[PDB]
């Protein structure tokens, strides 16, 4: 925002890489310096946080409760946006279509805040609007939810009314994809034990083989193969 | 007979569903990992 | 704790009641007509209980290795309208016995006390060796479950035999819905795995309520569960019902007993709470945990398992095929005092010594037994001991025949 | 200590995501605003720590001597406490 | 404090895929780096040359300033008209980056041997991970 | 043999400490690593 | 800043079981990756032998109510975990 | 088979140790832990 303009005076420059404000006493108050001193730190914060995360990176709380009409409630919680972590204190719940993909994601919702709107911010050390009470205004940006805006801070996608993917904690899954595939790079489509091709008539459906099979355990694609069951699966008689 | 082209599903053997019926026969060619099959052929010819 | 927790605010079921097998395993040999596995499980009757089904749940038949059996109800219970089946009491409790079918191949088997109204399942066990072959014969089975439940990751730090949990409720539902506690491992969701480690059914009869998280609700399992060290388990807190409202603690909140005072992050960061509208939508609480304690068998360093004798044993040969785990820092000595059909009258176990026997291997009497008093002696440690099933258990015996030719077949 | 009390007044709200302070020109000033400015920054800072760490997450230095009467003397280093990584100020051996 | 628990000075982050040369200029391509507690967008065009023999280390050096409203008509008060009383208030700290060769003080971002970029740390993760895995594929059974 | 089941301690067999003495014997049902002793089940009947 | 002990709700940097440090888990990653690999190694190849370890003997002429068991050196990922035991094996166990 | 050697020879092995206690005493040589016999090189 052009907060550079009065009343807000905000002279900060991230691309100078300004890093402190350096004052003098006895002061008439050219307060650009304060607007700036805050924003100075918030750029380095932004740099340092955005190395770690994408806008919509989910942290804590943040289960979900997809309703039957398909208003997705997401259970409230900590979520990353654009330099920083913010709490989705909202349960703000959105109609997903329940068909194809559904790009669930946030807007942080800009409102500029004078004490003149917000009398709770007017000088309660004396007669309330008592003059001191216009020291500063604010910005405010509470998060709010959207779907199929991929440019929103995208927290999820839901596929055909499923959450499309379920490894919530996920850094071990890189490792898993890797190791299972190492269980494929040497070799990895194998019977470790079991599975072999016996027979049995389905007689309930007397028109199929109820194929009798024991347990087996294995890897295929080097991903873990594990079907221990007393098996009888119908395929038609010849 | 067992030489098959699916990469997702495994060449174990055959269930061989019979005439008018259901049942298995695999006196036939085959494939297996590191050929544990060949390593069994050696054991098998040691049974011979 | 800082607030209640309604365990299923979704208030959504999945109707798995909870079956028990008595016996739950076998050791045997069978003239069913290599030094093989035990071919078919001998046709044998299993008594049972199942819990937390529908109120007077009806037509509950049973499938063993997934093959249809016939139930006989125990007292307190009727047949279904269907028979080979049970009708429960109002808790969905049912008890009785059924027969293990023929064609039941050796190995573990899935026992499936159900109708469409409720399912229930659990595994029977059967493995060891015959000294003469015929056929090898195995089919196996598999076990898991799901709900709209609460869950809680918790670790153990050294290996300890969990005997029970302790927990506190704000409020509870009715006497015929329930919490089931399972214990499970963890998946690469960071949430619980699906595996049945331990299970126990807990109606509002079973649950204790407090305004200040103090009503010490004790989660006892049927056998223990061994919580290994260095590992997160999870509690899965199965229910259909919201109205089981526990007492959780959460990040910097006023504590319920004394709300002037506020929590850590997770109360127990060596753990994580979860809540889910399908046992997968799990809320990652990097903010929260149950208020709880956990308790283990503080074992003494040894045990006696003083068996009642086998009598008129009348067998010149013997086997031990009992079954147990001896963990590390444990031992399971196995012994008899053998009174023989070879022996005189005054010979008494008092005169006999604890004569040891080796498991999964043959042994001789060299002429007939007549009573085998038995003891296994355990050796143990403060937190862990051997664990032997009373139906993993055989001290098997044999008589040999006096004639039995090798007639060779006719030769062209 | 609470800077929502007088004169410091701190009327910040993290639940709104109050995001920035827009100070106003040549200003007789409610020093009421000022606690509330660091409060605004403190929320996002705190969030970027507390969604990530546990208090007592060691970050440097903290090998140790157990004094053999049992006075533990951790050889000092960095630690997490709520919102932030900080040097742990002492050994403070007890 | 929080930067140094995660990053080390000279942790590159974006851009920077060399405009190296026969002249042995590396025009270190604009991109992010971690230096002195902070992730910083490097946006200079300073071309430093190497020799092409032995170990050569390329590194960024930051330098600080106080800067005053005398130098800066921008530090002259929007409570006011610019060129007047009130206006010449606070000065500023500023911290900007520069490219250097062999300087041990510099946050080293590339290292060279006989003109080879003999280093290439292309990952913090799958690099460090395979430095376990194919190595275990040597170890207590492997190497064949 | 005490048929130990410690889930760290693997089935080698027995050091049968001899009577009035100290030493070893190993003729047993006892099975060692994953039946790869198969290599010698084969090589024995070949060597006969 | 200050320290406490036996407050678990304090910023708990450690616990000292029986005045042991109860563990010493002091890396964030290599420990966690081993809690994958050697763990899979148990899953697929538990408490097993690659080689050696076999059951001959030696008498305890140093303590002659004992055997002084010479048993071989050997290897596996035993308990899923990196085992080679190379040793001058002469272990004291009782005589019969 | 074709195989390595059943015995290492009874070879004479000189030695040096450093960094024990000042004039430390009763220092037994323990070949494979087995007590053998030192030639004390006087001094």
HEC profile for chain C?
Answer: CCEEEECCCCCCCCCECEEEEECCEECCCCCCCCCCCCCECCCCEEEEEEECCCCCCCCEEEEECCEEECEEECCCCECCCCCEEEECCCCCCEEEEEECCCCCEECCEEEEEECCCCECCEEEEECCCCCCCCCCCECCCCCCCCCCCEEEEEEECCCEEEEEEEECEEECCCCCCEEEEEEECECCCCCECCCCCEEEEEEHHHCCECCCCCCCEEEEEEEEEEECCCEEEEEEEECCCCCCEEEEEECCCECCCCCCCECCCCCCCCEEEEECCCCCCCCCECCEEECEEEEECCCCCEEEEEEEEEECCCCCEEEECCCEECCCCCEEEEEEEEEECCCCCCCCCCCCCCEECCECEEEECCCCEEEEEEEEEEECCCCCCCEECCCCCCEEEECCCCCCCCCCCCCC
Mutate to test the interface with F, among B34, B42, B43 (most CBs of F within 10 A): B43
Burial class of residue C68 (count of CB atoms within 10 Å of its CB; 0-12, 13-18, 19+)? exposed
Burial class of residue B16 (count of CB atoms within 10 Å of its CB; 0-12, 13-18, 19+)? middle
Residues of A in contact with G35 (CB under 8 A): none
Q: Do the Cβ atoms of F22 and G96 come within 8 Å?
A: yes
Count the neighbouring beta carbons within 10 Å of the beta carbon of residue D73. Answer: 13
Q: Would you call H34 an interface residue with chain G, using a CB distance cutoff of 8 Å?
A: yes
Token pair for C41? 């499980």
Mutate to test the interface with A, among D5, D20, D25, D54 (most CBs of A within 10 A): D20
Can you give the length of chain A in residues?
A: 238
Q: Would you call D94 an interface residue with chain G, using a CB distance cutoff of 8 Å?
A: yes
User: Any contact of E with F, at least 3 CB pairs below 8 A?
Assistant: no
Cα torsion for C18, C20, C25, C30, to the nearest 10°?
Answer: -100
Q: Which residues of G touch F (CB under 8 A)?
A: 45-50, 53-60, 66-69, 71, 76, 78-79, 93-96
Q: Do the Cβ atoms of C283 and A229 come within 8 Å?
A: no
User: Any contact of C with H, at least 3 CB pairs below 8 A?
Assistant: no
The dihedral sign for the CA sequence C320, C326, C329, C332: negative
Residues 8-67 of D with CB under 8 A from G: 55-56, 58, 62, 64, 66
Q: Decide: D58 and D78 in contact? Cβ < 8 Å.
A: yes
Q: Do the Cβ atoms of D27 and A30 come within 8 Å?
A: no
Angle, vertex CA D8, rays to CA D3 and CA D10, nearest 5? 60
Residues of F in contact with B43 (CB under 8 A): 38, 42
G65 CB-near residues (< 8 Å, 6+ apart)? G94, G95
Q: Would you call C261 an interface residue with chain G, using a CB distance cutoff of 8 Å?
A: no
Q: How far apart are CA A90 and CA A75, in angstroms?
A: 8
Q: Would you call A175 an interface residue with chain G, using a CB distance cutoff of 8 Å?
A: yes
Q: How many CB pairs under 8 A join C and D?
A: 9
Can you give the length of chain C in residues?
A: 412
Q: Determine the distance in angstroms separating the CA of C286 from the nearest CA of chain A, rounded to an integer.
A: 5
Residues of D in contact with C272 (CB under 8 A): none
Q: Do the Cβ atoms of F4 and C325 come within 8 Å?
A: no
Closest Cα partner for A80 from A52, A106, A103, A58? A58
Q: Do the Cβ atoms of F5 and C326 come within 8 Å?
A: yes
Q: Do the Cβ atoms of C358 and F5 come within 8 Å?
A: no
The dihedral sign for the CA sequence E34, E37, E43, E49: negative
- HSE toward the beta carbon, residue C12, CA cutoff 13 A: 15
Q: Which chains touch F (3 or more CB pairs under 8 A)?
A: B, C, G
Q: Which chains touch A (3 or more CB pairs under 8 A)?
A: B, C, D, E, G
Residues of D in contact with G19 (CB under 8 A): 66, 70
Q: Decide: C255 and C263 in contact? Cβ < 8 Å.
A: yes
Q: How far apart are CA G37 and CA G41, in angstroms?
A: 6
User: Any contact of F with H, at least 3 CB pairs below 8 A?
Assistant: no
Q: How far apart are CA A109 and CA D89, in angstroms?
A: 40
Burial class of residue H31 (count of CB atoms within 10 Å of its CB; 0-12, 13-18, 19+)? exposed
Residue tagged 């044993």 (tokens): C313
Q: Would you call C155 an interface residue with chain D, using a CB distance cutoff of 8 Å?
A: no
Q: Determine the distance in angstroms separating the CA of G7 from the nearest CA of chain D, rounded to an integer.
A: 12
Phi, psi of A199 (to 5 degrees): -155, 165
Q: Do the Cβ atoms of B22 and A195 come within 8 Å?
A: no
Q: Determine the distance in angstroms separating the CA of F47 from the nearest CA of chain G, rounded to an integer.
A: 22
Residues of D in contact with A86 (CB under 8 A): 17, 44, 47
Q: How many CB pairs under 8 A join C and F?
A: 28
Q: Do the Cβ atoms of F10 and G47 come within 8 Å?
A: yes
Q: How far apart are CA A92 and CA A75, in angstroms?
A: 9
- What is the SS3 assignment for B2-33? CCCCCCCCCCCCCCCCCCCCCCCCCCCCCCCH
Residues of D in contact with G31 (CB under 8 A): none
Token pair for A42? 């918030």
Token pair for A176? 């898993």
Residues of B in contact with A238 (CB under 8 A): 17-22
Mutate to test the interface with F, among C127, C358, C376 (most CBs of F within 10 A): C358
Task: Give Dmax (Cα) for chain A.
Answer: 102
State this model's resolution in angstroms: 7.3
Residue tagged 């007789």 (tokens): D28
Residue A238 three-state SS: coil
Residues of G in contact with D74 (CB under 8 A): 3, 13-14
Residues of A in contact with B19 (CB under 8 A): 238
Q: Which chains touch D (3 or more CB pairs under 8 A)?
A: A, C, E, G
Q: How far apart are CA A109 and CA A103, in angstroms?
A: 19
F7, F10, F21: residue with CB nearest G96: F21
Q: Which residues of A touch B (CB under 8 A)?
A: 187, 189-191, 195-202, 208-211, 218, 220-221, 235-238
Q: How many CB pairs under 8 A join E and G?
A: 18
Closest-CA residue of A relative to C283 is A63
Burial class of residue C238 (count of CB atoms within 10 Å of its CB; 0-12, 13-18, 19+)? buried
Residues of G in contact with E133 (CB under 8 A): 37
Q: How far apart are CA C109 and CA G46, in angstroms?
A: 25
Q: Determine the distance in angstroms separating the CA of E16 from the nearest CA of chain A, rounded to an integer.
A: 16
Q: Decide: E32 and E6 in contact? Cβ < 8 Å.
A: no
């Amino acid at each position: 925002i052009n907060f550079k303009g009065s009343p807000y005076l905000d002279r900060f420059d991230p691309s100078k890489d300004r890093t402190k404000v350096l004052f003098n006493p006895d002061r008439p108050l050219q307060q650009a310096e304060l607007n700036e001193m805050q924003s100075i730190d918030q750029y380095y914060l932004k740099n340092l946080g955005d190395a770690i995360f994408k806008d919509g990176d989910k942290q804590s709380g943040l289960g979900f409760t997809l309703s039957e009409d398909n208003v997705l409630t997401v259970n409230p919680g900590y979520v990353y946006i654009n330099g920083k972590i913010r709490y989705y204190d909202n349960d703000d719940s959105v109609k997903i279509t329940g068909v194809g993909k559904e790009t669930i994601g946030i807007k942080l919702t800009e409102r500029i805040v004078t004490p003149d709107e917000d009398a709770s911010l007017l000088d309660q050390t004396s007669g309330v609007p008592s003059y001191f009470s216009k020291g500063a205004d604010r910005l405010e940006e509470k998060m709010s939810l959207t779907v199929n805006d991929p440019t929103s801070a995208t927290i999820y996608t839901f596929m055909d009314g499923d959450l499309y993917i379920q490894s919530t904690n996920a850094e071990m899954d890189k490792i898993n994809k890797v190791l299972a595939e190492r269980t494929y790079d040497e070799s990895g489509s194998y019977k470790v034990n079991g599975f072999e091709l016996f027979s049995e008539g389905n007689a309930e459906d007397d028109d199929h083989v109820s194929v009798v099979v024991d347990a087996g355990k294995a890897y295929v694609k080097g991903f873990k193969v594990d079907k221990p069951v007393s098996t009888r699966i119908s395929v038609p008689k010849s | 007979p067992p030489l098959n082209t699916d990469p997702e599903n495994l060449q174990l053997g055959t269930v061989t569903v019979l005439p008018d019926s259901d049942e298995a026969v695999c006196i036939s060619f085959a494939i297996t990992r590191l050929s544990m099959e060949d390593l069994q052929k050696v054991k098998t010819r040691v049974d011979n | 704790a800082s607030e209640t927790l309604n365990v299923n605010p979704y208030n959504i079921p999945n109707k798995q009641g909870v079956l028990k097998l008595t016996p739950s395993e076998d050791n045997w040999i069978d003239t069913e007509n290599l030094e093989e596995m035990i071919e078919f499980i001998r046709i044998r009757d299993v008594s049972f209980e199942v819990k937390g089904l529908n109120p007077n749940d009806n037509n509950l038949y049973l499938l063993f290795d997934g093959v249809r059996c016939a139930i006989t109800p125990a007292t307190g219970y009727r047949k279904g309208s269907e028979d080979g089946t049970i009708m429960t009491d109002a808790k969905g409790t049912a008890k009785g016995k059924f027969t293990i079918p023929a064609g039941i191949r050796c190995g573990n088997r899935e026992v499936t006390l159900k109708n469409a109204n409720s399912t229930s399942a659990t595994t029977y066990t059967a493995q060891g060796r015959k000294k003469t072959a015929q056929d090898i014969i195995i089919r196996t089975r598999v076990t898991v479950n799901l709900v709209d439940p609460l869950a809680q990751s918790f670790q153990y730090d050294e290996n300890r035999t969990i005997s029970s949990l302790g927990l506190y409720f704000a409020s509870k539902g009715d006497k015929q819905s329930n919490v089931v506690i399972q214990i499970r491992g963890m998946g690469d969701q960071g949430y619980p795995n699906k595996t049945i480690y331990a299970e126990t059914v807990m109606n509002a009869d079973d649950i204790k309520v407090s305004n200040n998280a103090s009503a010490e609700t004790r989660v006892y399992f049927d056998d223990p569960m061994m919580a290994e060290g260095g590992k997160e388990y999870a509690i899965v807190i199965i229910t259909e019902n919201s109205d089981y409202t526990m007492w959780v603690g959460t990040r910097t909140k006023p504590k319920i007993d004394k709300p002037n005072e506020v929590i850590s992050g997770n109360p127990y960061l060596q753990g994580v709470l979860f809540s889910s509208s399908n046992a997968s939508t799990w809320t990652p609480h990097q903010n929260s945990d149950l208020k709880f304690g956990i308790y283990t068998s503080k074992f003494n360093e040894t045990a006696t398992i003083e068996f009642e004798p086998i009598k008129d044993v009348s067998a010149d040969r013997i086997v031990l095929m009992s079954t147990y785990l001896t963990p590390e820092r444990t031992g399971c000595t196995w012994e008899m005092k053998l009174i023989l059909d070879d022996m005189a009258s005054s010979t008494t176990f008092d005169q006999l010594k604890w004569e040891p026997i080796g498991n999964y291997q043959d042994l001789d009497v060299l002429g007939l037994a007549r009573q085998v008093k038995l003891r296994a002696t355990f050796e143990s440690n403060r937190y862990i001991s051997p664990l032997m099933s009373s139906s993993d258990l055989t001290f098997t015996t044999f008589l040999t025949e006096l004639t039995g030719s090798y007639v060779g077949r006719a030769i062209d």
